[PDB]
Structure formats: C-alpha cells, structure tokens
Design a protein around this ligand. Structure first.
Ligand code: BCL
Ligand code: BCL
Ligand code: BCL
Ligand code: BCL
Ligand SMILES: CC[C@H]1c2cc3[nH]c4c(c3C)C(=O)[C@H](C(=O)OC)c4c3nc(cc4[nH]c(cc(n2)[C@@H]1C)c(C(C)=O)c4C)[C@@H](C)[C@@H]3CCC(=O)OC/C=C(\C)CCC[C@H](C)CCC[C@H](C)CCCC(C)C
Ligand SMILES: CC[C@H]1c2cc3[nH]c4c(c3C)C(=O)[C@H](C(=O)OC)c4c3nc(cc4[nH]c(cc(n2)[C@@H]1C)c(C(C)=O)c4C)[C@@H](C)[C@@H]3CCC(=O)OC/C=C(\C)CCC[C@H](C)CCC[C@H](C)CCCC(C)C
Ligand SMILES: COC1=C(OC)C(=O)C(C/C=C(\C)CC/C=C(\C)CC/C=C(\C)CC/C=C(\C)CC/C=C(\C)CC/C=C(\C)CC/C=C(\C)CC/C=C(\C)CC/C=C(\C)CCC=C(C)C)=C(C)C1=O
Ligand SMILES: COC1=C(OC)C(=O)C(C/C=C(\C)CC/C=C(\C)CC/C=C(\C)CC/C=C(\C)CC/C=C(\C)CC/C=C(\C)CC/C=C(\C)CC/C=C(\C)CC/C=C(\C)CCC=C(C)C)=C(C)C1=O
Ligand SMILES: COC(C)(C)C/C=C/C(C)=C/C=C/C(C)=C/C=C/C(C)=C\C=C\C=C(C)\C=C\C=C(/C)CC/C=C(\C)CCC=C(C)C
Ligand SMILES: CCCCCCCCCCCC[N+](C)(C)[O-]
Ligand SMILES: CCCCCCCCCCCC[N+](C)(C)[O-]
Ligand SMILES: CCCCCCCCCCCC[N+](C)(C)[O-]
Ligand SMILES: CCCCCCCCCCCC[N+](C)(C)[O-]
Ligand SMILES: [Fe+3]
Lengths: 240, 281, 302
C-alpha cells in the first residue's frame, strides 16, 4: 500500500543521503595515511568526492578540495613502538616545535579580511569608534602566569571589527616588546588579568607578529597553538 | 589509519588514570583507561541482555524487553528473571555512559581543547539517571522506571503519560518542548547560513561573515554572530533536556494528580475567580 | 582556572554596522536602532538595520491581521471583560467550521468563517515571508539554503491546515487557534488514528528532533572548545583549515571513529533538522487519508 511504499522509499533515500553526507566530509584529511605518511591500504567503503573549487573573495585566488595534502612544515616527533597505534614523542621542545597541544597549521600568511576588504582584526587604537563598552577594561592591568609571577601588562585590545568583539590582548613584556594573548584563554579579574596556560617565563617564547598593526592567519595559529599547548607542557610550573 | 594532519597530535599524555598504560589508539579510536572501562561495562551489559533474551524465549529485537522489578520489591533487590537483570544492566549502562564522558575528557586534555563536549553529554546522562534512578528512589520502587525494549519503552511513555491525563499540561513539559522546537529552528538556520555563504550563486565569489551578518539584519532586524549562534545552540539544546528531566522529576512525586487540573491555581485566583462569563464561569 | 566562553568578559563597541551593499536596494533598509548591552554579553549588541521592502510589509500587515482576528474573538468569548480575558486566556479558542460546510466558505462567523478569515491572513503572511527569505539571499548573491530549509517547516504546517483538510473534504480536520485547544487537538489526533506512536514517520520525526538537540549540543560545544584557536570563524576555516578545524575533527575521530569537515558538519546540521518536519509532514498526511489506524496498519504492514 501507499504508506508502505512511502516508508520503504524513505529508507533508500536516507541511505543515499548518509552516503553523500559522508563523502562531503572527506574533502579534508584524506586519503588516510600510515604513520609514515605513505597511503594506507584500507580506505573504507566510501570513495573520495569529485573536487569542488571555492573562488575566494578578494582575489586571494582559489581552493580545490579534495586536493594534495601536505604539512608545509617539519614534524619533530619519533615513534615509541614498533607497531601502529602508539604515541609519538617530541624529539625536542614540543612548545617551540609546535607539536601535540602546541600544534599549529601553516595557514596563509595574510590576515583575514572583512567583506569590504579591510583587516578583520585591528588593535583598538587603529580602530576608529571602538571603545570598551561594558565590563572591566583590561588595558593597563598587569598580567600574571600560572606560576604566580607577573609577566607583562596589557597595552591594547585587538578587536574583531565586523564581529565587534575582543579577540586578543596585546601585552608588553619586560623587553618592552609586545605579544598577543587570545581572549579565550585569559580571566579578566578586577585587579589583574590571569593566565593559567602559561607561566611567566614562557611569555617571551610566544610567537611574535611581523607587523605591529596586523596579524596573519599563520600567526594566530602559532600564537593560539603555543599558549594552548601550555596547558599540558607548562604544568610543572602551574600552581594551586 | 591516520588523517593527513593527525600524527603531530598523537603525542603522549593527557590521561586521568593509569599513566602511559592505556595511552594508545586502535585504528581511529582512542583507548585510555576509560576506554577499557567502557568496553567492560558494555560487553557485560550486552551479555546480560542476551541472557535476558533466553529467559524470555526471543531472539527478535522488536520483541526483546528487559522489564524492571515490580512494585512489590520496592527499592530492594529482585530475582534475575523478574527484575534483577534490569537492575544490573542499569548499573552497567550508567557505567558505560560515565566512563564514556570521562574518556572524552582525556581526549580533550591531549588535544589541548576545552571541556564543553563532556560537560554537554553529562546532561544526557542526567536525563537518563532521572528516569531510571532519581524518580524511582523518590517514588519508592524501581518499577516506575522504564523498560529496555524498542517498543515496550514507548508503551511505558504512553502509559506513564496518560496516568496524568493529557500530558501536554505538565507546565515544565510545555517549556521543554519549546526549547526542542527552538533548537531545531536554530540548527536549521545556522546550517543554512554557513552553507549559503560557502556556496553562493554560479561563479560568484565565496561570501563572507559580513554577508551572513547582513542577511539576518535584512530579514529579522538582528544578528547574533558566530560565537553567538554556537552559544545559542549549546544552550537551547542543553536547556531542552534540563526541562525534560525537570518535568519528570516533579510528576509522580510532588504532583500525582491530573496535569490539566493544576492550571486551576490560575483560574481560581480570588480577583477573577467568580466573575461571570468566559469559559470557566 | 580557565574561562568558558558563554558570556563575554569585556564588551567593545564602535560605529553602527550598515552591512554589505552588493545588490540590495538601500532605499528600504531602516536606521540602525539602539545597542543592547544585555544582548551583547551573549551575541551582538547591535539592533541594527532591518531591510523592509514591499513583501516584508505585506507579511507584517496580514500577520498582525491574523493575530488580531483571533484576539478580538477571544474578547467576544470573555464578555469584553479584561478580568476574564486574562483568566481564561489559554482556554479560549477560535475553532474551524463545523463538518456540515465541508470545504466551503459559506459558514457563519460564529461557526467557522472568522477561522477562514484568520487562516487566509496567515497563509499569505507565511508565503510572502518565505519569498522574502529567498529574495534577501539573492540580493546578497548567496545560495538559497535558508529558503529550502524554511520550505520544510512550511511543509508540516501546509499539511496540518490545508493539504490534509482538503483531502478529507472538510475544514474540521484543521487545527484551531488556542493554547490549550490546539494541544487538545493534538492529543485527540493520536487517539483517533490509533496511537501515532505506531506511525513509522512520527517516530522517525522524533529521531531527528532528538538528533537535532544531540547534534547542536555536539557542534556548539565543539566550536566553544576550539574557540581558543578561533574556531568560530567557520567560513575562513573552510577556505583555509586551521588547527581549530583539525583538533575538532580529531576529537571526534578519536572518540567515535569518524569525523566531519568544517563545511560538512553544517550539511549534517541542516539535514538532521530539516528531516524533522519532512518525515513528520508525510506521517500526518497519511494519517486519515490512507491509514485509519496506525495500530492496525502496523499489524499487517499495508
Ligand atoms: C506537534 C505539532 C502540533 C503542536 C503541538 C504542540 C505541543 C505539544 C506544544 C506546543 C507548544 C507551542 N505551540 Mg504548537 N503545535 C502545532 C502547531 C503550532 C503552530 C503552527 C503549525 O502554526 C504554532 C504557531 C504553534 C505555536 C505554539 C506555541 C504557543 C508553543 C511554543 C512554540 C515554539 O516553541 O516555537 C519555537 C520558538 C519560537 C520563539 C518561534 C517564534 C514564535 C513564538 C514567538 C511563539 C508565538 C506564539 C503565538 C503565535 C501567540 C501566543 C500568544 C499568547 C498571548 C501567548 N504550534 C501542531 C498542531 N505545540 C508548546 C506549548 O508550551 O504550548 C503552550 C507545547 O508544549
Ligand atoms: C527520551 C525520552 C523517553 C523516550 C521516548 C522515545 C520516543 C517517543 C521515541 C523514542 C525513539 C527511540 N528511542 Mg527512546 N526514550 C527514552 C530513553 C531512551 C534511551 C535511553 C535513555 O537510554 C535510548 C537508548 C532511547 C531510544 C530510542 C531509539 C531506539 C529511538 C530513536 C533515537 C534517535 O533517533 O535519536 C537519538 C539519537 C541519535 C539520532 C543518534 C543515535 C541513535 C542510535 C540508533 C541509538 C539507538 C540504540 C538502540 C537500538 C539500543 C541499542 C542498545 C545496545 C547497544 C544493544 N531512548 C525515554 C523513555 N524514544 C523514537 C523511535 O524511533 O521509536 C522506537 C520514538 O518515537
Ligand atoms: C502519550 C505521551 C505523552 C507524553 C509523555 C511523556 C513522558 C512520560 C515523558 C515525556 C518526555 C518528553 N516529551 Mg512528552 N508526551 C506527549 C507528547 C509530547 C510531544 C507532542 C505531543 O508533540 C512532544 C514534542 C513531547 C516532547 C517531550 C520531550 C520534552 C521529552 C523527551 C526528551 C528527553 O527527555 O530527552 C532526554 C534524553 C535521554 C534520557 C537520552 C540519554 C541518552 C543516554 C545518556 C546515552 C544512550 C547511549 C546509547 C544507549 C548508546 C547507543 C549505542 C551506539 C553507540 C549507538 N512530548 C504525550 C502527551 N513525555 C520524557 C522526558 O521528559 O524525560 C525525562 C518522558 O519520560
Ligand atoms: C498525545 C500526543 C501524541 C502525538 C501527536 C502528534 C501530532 C498530532 C503531531 C505530532 C508531531 C510531532 N511530534 Mg508527537 N505525539 C505524541 C508524543 C510525542 C513525543 C513523546 C511522547 O515523547 C515526542 C518526542 C513527539 C514529537 C513530535 C515531533 C517530532 C513532531 C513535530 C515536529 C515539529 O517540530 O513541529 C513544529 C513545527 C511546526 C508545526 C511547523 C511550524 C512552521 C510554521 C510555518 C510557523 C508559523 C509561524 C507563525 C506564522 C507566526 C508565529 C508568531 C511569531 C511571533 C512570528 N511526539 C503522542 C503519541 N505529534 C507532528 C508530526 O510531525 O506528526 C508525525 C504532528 O502533527
Ligand atoms: C524545519 C522546521 C523547523 C524550523 C525552521 C525554520 N523556521 C523558519 C525558518 C527555518 C529554516 C526561516 O528561515 C524562517 C525565519 O524567518 O527565521 C527566523 C522561519 C520561521 N519560523 C517561525 C516560527 C516557528 N517555526 C517553528 C518550527 C520550526 N521551524 C522547526 C523547528 C515553530 C513551531 C515550533 O511551531 C514556530 C512557532 C517564524 C519565526 C519564521 C516565519 C515567520 C512568518 O512567516 O510570519 C510572518 C510574520 C508574522 C505573522 C508577524 C505577526 C504576528 C506576531 C505575533 C505579531 C508581532 C510581530 C511584530 C514584533 C510586530 C511589530 C509591529 C510594528 C510596531 C513594527
Ligand atoms: C544534552 C543532551 C542531548 C545530547 C547530547 C550529547 N549526547 C552525546 C554527546 C552529547 C554532547 C556526546 O559527546 C556523546 C557522543 O559521543 O555523540 C556521538 C553522546 C551520545 N549520545 C548518545 C545517544 C543519545 N543521546 C540522546 C539525547 C541527547 N544527547 C540530547 C539531545 C538520545 C536520546 C534523545 O534518546 C540518545 C539515544 C550516544 C550516541 C552517545 C553516547 C555513546 C556511549 O555512551 O557509549 C558508551 C555506551 C555504549 C557503547 C552502550 C553499551 C550498552 C549498555 C551498557 C546497555 C544498553 C542499555 C540501554 C538502556 C538499552 C535501551 C534501549 C531501548 C530504550 C530502546
Ligand atoms: C554566524 O552565523 C549566524 C549569525 O550571525 C551572523 C546569525 O545572525 C544567525 C541568526 C540568529 C538569530 C536571529 C537568533 C535565533 C533565535 C530565536 C529565538 C528566533 C526568534 C525569532 C525572531 C527574531 C523572528 C521573529 C519575527 C518575525 C518573523 C517578524 C520580524 C519583525 C520585526 C523584527 C519587527 C519589525 C520592525 C520594525 C518595522 C522597526 C521599526 C522601527 C522604527 C520606527 C524606529 C544565525 C542563525 C547564524 O547562524
Ligand atoms: C565543526 O567541528 C565538528 C567536527 O569536525 C570538524 C565533527 O566531526 C563533529 C562530529 C560530527 C559528525 C561526524 C556528524 C555525524 C554525527 C552524528 C549524526 C551524531 C550521531 C553519532 C552516531 C550514531 C555514532 C555513534 C557511534 C559510536 C559512539 C562509536 C561506536 C563505538 C565503538 C566501536 C566502541 C569504542 C571502542 C573502544 C573504547 C576501544 C576498546 C578497546 C580495547 C582493546 C578493550 C562535530 C559535532 C563538529 O562540531
Ligand atoms: C491583547 O489583545 C489583542 C487585540 C492585541 C489581541 C491579542 C492576540 C491574541 C490573544 C492572539 C492569540 C493567537 C493564538 C494563541 C494563536 C495560536 C495558534 C496555535 C497555538 C497553533 C497554530 C496552528 C495553525 C496552523 C497549523 C494553521 C495552518 C493554516 C494553513 C496551512 C493555511 C490554511 C488556509 C486556509 C483554510 C484558507 C485558504 C484560503 C486561500 C484562498 C489561500
Ligand atoms: C542509491 C539510491 C539513491 C536514492 C536517492 C538518494 C538521495 C541522495 C540525497 C543527497 C542529494 C544531495 N544534493 C541535493 C546536494 O544533491
Ligand atoms: C547516524 C550515523 C551515521 C554513520 C554513517 C557512517 C559512519 C562511518 C563511516 C566513516 C568511515 C571513515 N573512515 C575512518 C574510513 O575514514
Ligand atoms: C551506529 C553507527 C556506528 C558507526 C561507527 C563507525 C566506526 C568507523 C570505524 C572505521 C575504522 C577505520 N580506520 C582504521 C581506517 O581508521
Ligand atoms: C542525519 C541522519 C541521522 C540518521 C538517524 C537514524 C535514526 C534511526 C531511527 C530508527 C527508528 C525508526 N522507526 C520507528 C521508523 O522504526
Ligand atoms: Fe557552526
């Protein structure tokens, strides 16, 4: 009958949908590899999709996925076992090398631009109209590490203009040099800004930007990577 | 066995229990101590559910059903074939769920991300535990819990519902439905937006976050933003299940009459309780 | 101890954003409204500019007309007394025409009629708003995803009050306007079709609704967890995959054995949800037109 045909037709539709959906979610990361980077034997039941091309918005070109997969950087790790499936230890300083929780990817070394072609993320000084609106204004507050030492002080807030949102705090060290800390990794207290992920002595090691007005996508990744990786690697210096 | 970018993340560390002992993968799956815990509890419960199938004489999943003890045993134990197999599987299931949540935490730590996913899952674990554990112990018997079968658990819903009249009238239940209908509106929109931006017309360029931001202002006169919609979704969702557990914890315990009659507190308010006309006068 | 990122610690305001121009007729967009500081702890603060062309105005007029048609009737029932009106608010109901009139517009106002009037006003309100959902997208040159997803919601609605009332030959099969009354209709419907828990579409609809809450719980929490690497910037993470996208995919591969991409997860999202009202609308459409009792049908599938 009518209802039996409807439901049976549905289950066949659903199986085509699951299929299509799963192949869509294979335009990155694939094909699978062995721990040594060569192509894995078993790829599972699903084929790679036919590539699609994004025309990027500001003449920044083209993206085609799936397409040739590579880390355009060296991985400082070694096997800890003779067979698949085990941890790969850092062969150096995991923080400095950018591995594990401290990983970054080699994104493009341009900043992200808004709809009109302007840098999405300005320091607030260079951003006209933009003021702290509610909550404690962090600019001027000293910055503390997970070891209970002072590392620097906040000298500006870098804001997302189109989101109208604080993405970073620019922080001055005893060098007189600045760093970016992500908003999402600091507690703005009343009398200070606290940073759990990093101890004071690791602040110098934060990756620095090559133009004090702007950040690139490559640079946010190295910075956010660095400081997040501290949650694991700076924990001999974390106190409570 | 590895995504092209995966190896750099597969470092040692992050485990809550047992150090580098259970610190490995099997294919894509991370193990950990709680990976082992979740297999133990899962196998046991699956084997008890197979053994509960031979006591019933069915190997059909649309028929198999593992009922709680009857009210007669109260909050005490029960014989396997008459409610004890349920009681043990419930321990084994709760064991699998809490174990799974804690395995997610270990995966969190190794990846250096936040703990939001474990945290969100714990609300689902909590809704379950309300039904099979909190409402029982407050009422006075495991018998008020629901049975483990595909349609038999549905029959428990319909009967527990209709015990109280048309269950629509549980006011906490009303609220919870709103969050469910809303969370699905939001998930429809969020998915549609991102996709309409990433996949524009013909040979137009990929749209930007500003087009998403514009599109909504154009339409509804407001826009909440990327961080905003992902906070809204986690929140509608988690809130829907909070009001579900709530509407059930109060039914049968502080309220056991018909849910429709509860709404007489409103209609019998002394300022209008007696005025002629209307539906209720 | 780390910040969780559900409310901002520090708000930041600048010049009112007037949006992208592309092809939009700026002659219609309003003036930027105020900036809600309350709103801004969670999402954006700007109650900025709403576009409002001719299709938008058509909607608001008839949407209010429907809203008023029902409401003046609630007073006629309340005896025009504000005290009663407020007491019996959930109890009032604008009910469809009696089965006598079938599919005609010949009913009195106090026996239907007013119901048809309201429904016409709602019909025109929803369809114009839909077209507005399409047009707003075209002006910006975006895909029509939002218009397709909205169509699926329209489906269920379109079935409950129009398609299915037509196929039974009666407006009585339609949902009345009332808070407690439309609830009663719903519980009633299940009963008369032999328990909708037996409708295999109903219970698929539930799977998707449950799954919508499960997915958005999953996604939302995942983007929050990787916002420390700027995960929320999903469009750019699609064109240039960051570590946010990677540890997000990797959390889930390591947990459950497979994963999504930053684009792909939104295809999962729009479908999971859109199938709630798609399946659910077929399940209602079959109830009473082809299947009289979902218990009976279930016994001898057919
Ligand atoms: C399963 C489908 C059944 C049904 C079963 C149920 C059940 C079961 C419940 C509801 C509930 C609700 N239903 Mg219903 N309902 C159906 C079809 C509808 C339709 C329709 C198709 O046009 C509408 C407009 C409503 C509207 C409503 C709301 C009063 C309420 C919460 C809705 C919501 O969370 O939206 C998502 C959220 C939004 C914010 C969307 C925006 C719309 C908002 C603003 C609500 C508008 C309400 C209305 C137009 C005016 C009310 C005026 C009064 C003075 C309050 N239902 C059909 C008949 N409905 C719940 C309730 O608590 O009712 C008392 C509830 O428990
Ligand atoms: C939640 C509130 C009520 C309830 C009310 C309903 C109603 C009403 C309906 C269901 C439906 C379903 N019920 Mg239930 N159900 C309850 C508690 C539970 C629990 C539990 C707490 O452990 C489980 C496992 C399930 C439920 C199941 C699924 C088999 C089914 C669809 C779920 C889904 O698609 O979305 C959730 C999840 C996803 C989309 C992803 C995961 C889905 C997979 C398929 C999980 C199913 C596993 C199942 C077969 C058990 C295997 C056990 C061992 C591994 C062998 N419910 C309580 C009693 N349930 C619908 C149905 O399909 O009828 C039979 C339906 O109409
Ligand atoms: C005839 C039936 C009655 C009625 C009686 C009840 C009763 C009684 C109950 C509800 C409950 C619910 N009702 Mg009702 N309800 C009715 C009509 C409705 C209508 C409608 C008319 O449109 C709607 C929309 C709802 C909506 C809802 C929800 C608010 C709620 C279910 C969600 C939930 O709790 O998730 C919670 C989710 C879970 C518990 C799942 C947790 C999953 C666990 C942690 C893990 C599972 C792992 C799995 C086994 C592994 C799979 C193996 C493989 C790996 C896949 N009801 C009518 C009036 N309603 C239920 C509720 O509120 O629950 C507290 C409930 O018990
Ligand atoms: C006693 C009640 C019966 C029963 C009878 C029904 C009936 C009757 C129906 C459902 C339907 C549904 N039921 Mg049931 N259901 C029961 C028990 C349950 C239980 C449970 C016990 O746990 C659950 C989980 C559900 C769950 C569900 C949903 C999956 C489904 C509705 C999807 C939806 O989102 O509609 C919400 C969305 C809409 C109605 C569409 C809205 C779109 C329109 C266009 C919006 C208009 C807005 C307006 C113009 C303006 C608003 C004002 C604003 C301010 C602007 N039912 C029992 C068995 N159920 C529906 C279905 O899908 O059947 C298969 C249905 O019709
Ligand atoms: C797949 C289905 C799911 C879903 C999806 C969905 N809904 C959608 C969309 C999508 C993808 C849209 O794009 C569209 C939308 O507009 O998004 C915001 C919409 C929409 N879903 C809506 C509601 C809605 N969706 C529902 C359900 C669902 N929608 C499911 C969860 C429900 C349920 C649960 O029953 C409701 C209540 C609307 C918000 C919107 C379509 C609005 C519409 O078409 O009506 C036109 C306008 C009016 C009737 C307004 C007048 C009535 C008001 C009560 C008066 C107040 C208005 C105003 C403030 C007055 C101001 C007057 C002057 C002084 C200015
Ligand atoms: C806030 C609650 C919302 C939500 C969120 C949510 N669920 C989650 C998560 C989150 C954030 C995860 O991280 C986790 C996940 O890994 O997703 C893929 C998960 C998860 N939610 C799941 C299911 C699920 N969630 C549900 C609901 C919800 N989850 C809400 C919508 C439902 C509903 C609606 O019914 C179901 C069925 C799983 C896919 C997964 C957890 C998997 C897991 O716990 O693995 C360990 C356990 C086993 C492998 C099973 C072992 C077998 C048992 C020991 C015995 C079986 C007993 C059982 C009672 C049988 C009952 C059957 C009958 C009732 C039919
Ligand atoms: C990055 O992704 C994302 C965004 O961020 C860029 C987003 O924005 C959004 C969008 C998200 C939301 C809007 C939140 C959704 C949550 C809800 C609870 C939905 C509630 C519903 C509504 C706001 C719409 C209901 C209203 C309707 C249909 C009618 C619209 C009418 C008006 C607003 C009033 C008309 C106003 C006038 C004429 C102003 C007059 C002024 C003066 C005279 C002065 C999503 C999904 C997203 O994914
Ligand atoms: C933007 O970011 C995001 C991602 O990507 C960047 C993502 O991918 C995802 C994830 C989402 C998807 C891939 C979309 C599809 C997902 C769903 C519809 C959700 C429902 C999921 C399921 C039904 C699958 C459930 C399956 C499970 C839990 C796996 C089955 C279990 C096992 C095989 C047992 C586990 C084994 C162990 C512990 C090993 C034991 C070993 C011994 C030796 C003992 C999200 C949310 C996301 O937001
Ligand atoms: C404060 O006092 C004032 C004056 C402001 C008024 C107050 C307003 C009030 C109290 C409003 C209350 C309204 C309510 C509560 C409405 C509730 C609706 C509910 C709860 C559910 C709605 C479901 C209705 C649906 C599914 C209707 C579907 C209708 C359609 C599919 C279209 C049907 C169209 C028809 C019959 C006409 C066909 C005509 C043509 C030519 C196309
Ligand atoms: C193998 C039988 C196929 C039956 C039909 C399956 C439908 C596939 C659903 C995905 C369609 C996707 N779309 C619209 C983007 O092309
Ligand atoms: C609702 C659940 C849908 C599950 C769909 C199938 C998921 C498993 C397929 C993923 C295959 C992946 N892998 C590891 C080969 O890359
Ligand atoms: C209920 C659906 C469960 C889906 C489970 C999907 C697990 C896929 C496992 C693929 C194993 C792949 N490998 C070795 C290539 O990584
Ligand atoms: C986005 C795809 C998600 C697929 C979810 C699959 C849930 C299957 C639920 C089966 C229960 C159905 N029923 C009642 C019709 O038999
Ligand atoms: Fe998203």
């Amino acid at each position: 009958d009518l209802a039996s045909l409807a439901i049976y037709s549905f289950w066949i539709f659903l199986a085509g949908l699951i299929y299509y959906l799963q192949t869509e979610n294979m335009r990155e990361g694939y094909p699978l590899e062995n721990e040594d980077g060569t192509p894995a034997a078993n790829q599972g039941p699903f084929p790679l999709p036919k590539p699609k091309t994004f025309i990027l918005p500001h003449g920044r070109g083209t993206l085609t996925v799936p397409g040739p997969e590579s880390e355009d950087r060296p991985i400082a790790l070694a096997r800890t076992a003779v067979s698949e499936g085990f941890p790969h230890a850092p062969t150096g300083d995991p923080m400095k090398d950018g591995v594990g929780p401290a990983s970054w990817v080699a994104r493009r070394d341009l900043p992200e631009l808004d709809g009109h072609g302007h840098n999405k993320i300005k320091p607030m000084k260079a951003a006209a109209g933009f003021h702290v609106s509610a909550g404690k204004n962090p600019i001027g507050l000293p910055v503390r590490g997970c070891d209970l030492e002072i590392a620097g002080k906040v000298v500006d807030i870098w804001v997302d203009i189109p989101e109208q949102m604080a993405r970073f705090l620019e922080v001055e060290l005893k060098d007189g040099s600045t760093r970016l800390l992500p908003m999402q990794m600091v507690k703005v207290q009343s009398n200070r800004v606290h940073v759990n992920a990093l101890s004071s002595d690791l602040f110098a090691g934060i990756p620095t930007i090559k133009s004090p007005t702007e950040v690139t996508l490559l640079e946010e990744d190295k910075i956010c990577g660095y400081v997040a990786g501290g949650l694991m690697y700076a924990a001999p210096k974390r106190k409570s | 066995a590895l995504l092209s970018f995966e190896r750099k993340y597969r470092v040692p560390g992050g485990t809550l229990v047992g150090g580098n002992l259970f610190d490995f993968w099997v294919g894509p799956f991370y193990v950990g101590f709680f990976g082992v815990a979740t297999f133990f509890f899962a196998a046991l419960g699956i084997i008890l559910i197979a053994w509960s199938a031979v006591l019933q004489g069915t190997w059909n999943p649309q028929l198999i059903s593992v009922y709680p003890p009857a009210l007669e045993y109260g909050l005490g134990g029960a014989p396997l074939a008459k409610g004890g197999l349920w009681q043990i599987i419930t321990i084994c299931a709760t064991g699998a769920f809490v174990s799974w949540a804690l395995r997610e935490v270990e995966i969190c730590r190794k990846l250096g991300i936040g703990y939001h996913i474990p945290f969100a899952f714990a609300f689902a674990i909590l809704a379950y535990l309300t039904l099979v554990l909190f409402r029982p112990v407050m009422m006075g018997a495991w018998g008020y819990a629901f049975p483990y079968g595909i349609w038999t658990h549905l029959d428990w819903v319909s009967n527990t519902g209709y015990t109280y009249g048309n269950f629509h009238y549980n006011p906490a239940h009303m609220i919870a439905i709103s969050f469910f209908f809303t969370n699905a509106l939001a998930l429809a929109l969020h998915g549609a937006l991102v996709l309409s931006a990433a996949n524009p017309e013909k040979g137009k360029e990929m749209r930007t976050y500003d087009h998403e931001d514009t599109f909504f202002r154009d339409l509804v006169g407001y826009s909440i933003g990327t961080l905003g919609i992902h906070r809204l979704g986690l929140l509608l969702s988690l809130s829907a299940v909070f009001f579900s557990a709530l509407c059930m914890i109060i039914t049968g315990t502080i309220w056991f009459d018909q849910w429709v009659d509860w709404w007489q507190w409103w209609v019998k308010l002394p300022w209008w309780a007696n005025i002629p006309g209307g539906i209720n006068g | 101890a780390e910040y969780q990122n559900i409310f901002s610690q520090v708000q930041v305001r600048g010049p009112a954003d007037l949006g992208m121009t592309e092809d939009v007729n700026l002659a219609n967009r309003s003036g930027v409204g105020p900036f809600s500081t309350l709103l801004g702890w969670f999402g954006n603060a700007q109650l900025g500019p709403i576009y409002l062309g001719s299709l938008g105005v058509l909607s608001l007029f008839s949407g209010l007309m429907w809203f008023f048609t029902i409401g003046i009737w609630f007073w006629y029932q309340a005896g025009w007394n504000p005290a009663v009106f407020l007491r019996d608010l959930f109890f009032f109901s604008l009910e469809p025409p009696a089965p006598e009139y079938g599919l005609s517009f010949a009913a009195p106002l106090k026996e239907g009629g007013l119901w048809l009037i309201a429904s016409f006003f709602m019909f025109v309100a929803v369809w114009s708003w839909w077209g507005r959902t399409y047009l707003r997208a075209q002006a910006l040159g975006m895909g029509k995803h939002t218009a397709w997803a909205f169509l699926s919601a329209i489906w269920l609605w379109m079935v409950l009050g129009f398609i299915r009332p037509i196929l039974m030959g009666s407006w009585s099969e339609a949902v009345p306007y009332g808070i407690f009354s439309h609830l009663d209709w719903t519980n009633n419907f299940s009963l008369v079709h032999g328990n909708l828990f037996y409708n295999p579409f109903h219970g698929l609809s539930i799977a998707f609704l449950y799954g919508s809450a499960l997915l958005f719980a999953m996604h939302g929490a995942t983007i929050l967890a990787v916002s420390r690497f700027g995960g929320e910037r999903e469009l750019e993470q699609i064109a240039d995959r960051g570590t946010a996208a990677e540890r997000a995919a990797l959390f889930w591969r390591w947990t459950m054995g497979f994963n999504a991409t930053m684009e792909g997860i939104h295809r999962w999202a729009i479908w999971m949800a859109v199938l709630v009202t798609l399946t659910g609308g077929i399940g209602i459409l079959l109830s009473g037109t082809v299947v009289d009792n979902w218990y009976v049908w279930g016994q001898n599938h057919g």
